[PDB]
Structures are given as structure tokens and as C-alpha cells.
Amino acid sequence: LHKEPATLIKAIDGDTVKLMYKGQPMTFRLLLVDTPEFNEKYGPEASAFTKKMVENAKKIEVEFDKGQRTDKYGRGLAYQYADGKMVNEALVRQGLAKVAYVYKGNNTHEQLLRKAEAQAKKEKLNIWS
Ligand SMILES: Cc1cn([C@H]2C[C@H](OP(=O)(O)O)[C@@H](COP(=O)(O)O)O2)c(=O)[nH]c1=O
Ligand SMILES: [Ca+2]
């Protein structure tokens, strides 16, 4: 897989961010994770975590996987990097997202994210507490 440039337009919630990608505004949904909705327990914490990570980054990148690049809502499906740190992994490692929505062909980083989840769970962090 390959990282490509994007710039932040606006944080939205724990697992969706508005980015400008090839010059066009798009809502991106993070691959392989599910954060609580803002109205649910840990939802505001997930939103805050992703907001801080993308707003503080000097460089955001998106990385598409091998399969579908947009979902049925027209959201981009990618892994997101903030100064080289994967947002998807960081949320899972902090117990603010569960690994989820693991569809065949878009699952390159599944085992990396499962390993982070196992660690967050061993630590009883957030959702796992
Ligand atoms: C993460 C992800 C979500 N989706 C769709 C499945 C779910 O459909 P439904 O809306 O019918 O439940 C929805 C979940 O996204 P959210 O967690 O953002 O609600 O997005 C994909 O199709 N592919 C993906 O990789
Ligand atoms: Ca969600």
C-alpha cells in the first residue's frame, strides 16, 4: 500500500474526518475500526482523540487498501496517518475504537490493529474498562 497526501478540512467524530484529497473535499471513514457515536459512552472521548491527532499533525496522509475505496455513503475508506502515526491504530490501542467492519480485500492492517486491541483490552482501557 501507498501513502498519499491529504489536508485536514474538519474533524467530524471518532472515526470520520473531512479531508481534502486530490483537491476535493471528502468525508473519510477510518478502515477496520468503530468508534462509539458521539451520543454514546466514550464517543466524546473518541471524537476528541481523533480531533487532537488530526489538528495537531503537520502532515496528514491517507492510504487506501486493495479493495473498495468509497463506501455506499460516498465516504473514502482509508487508513489515516498523522505525522506518520496511524490514527486507526492509535484509537484501537487506546481502547477508544473496536476492530470492526473487516471486509475481505480491505483488511491489510487487520492483524496490526487486532494486536493493538489485545493490548488495550489487557490494560482495561476505556471501552475495555
Ligand atoms: C468502515 C466501513 C463502513 N461501511 C458501512 C457499513 C455500515 O453500513 P450501515 O450504515 O448500513 O450500518 C456503515 C457503518 O459506518 P458507521 O460506523 O460510520 O456508522 O458503513 C462500509 O461499507 N465499509 C467500511 O469499510
Ligand atoms: Ca462509528
Q: What is the CATH number of the domain that holds 25?
A: 2.40.50.90
Domain enclosing residue 74, as ranges: 1-129
Tell me, in angstroms, the distance from the centre of ligand 1 to residue 67's CA.
15
Place of cell 487487520: 110
83 annotated ligand binder: no
Please, which residues bridge with residue 61 across strands? 5, 81
Q: Where are the alpha helices (DSSP H) in the chain?
A: 43-56, 87-93, 110-122
Exp. method: X-ray
Strand 24-30 with 16-21, pairing? antiparallel
- Total structural domains in the chain? 1
Q: Of 78, 71, 67, 89, whose CA–CA distance to 19 is shortest?
A: 78
Q: Of 81, 94, 93, whose CA–CA distance to 30 is shortest?
A: 81
At 65, which amino acid appears? Answer: D
Q: What share of the chain is helix, strand, coil (3-state, %, to 5)?
A: 30, 30, 40
HSE, side-chain direction, 13 A CA sphere, residue 86: 18
Tell me, in angstroms, the distance from the centre of ligand 1 to residue 19's CA.
18
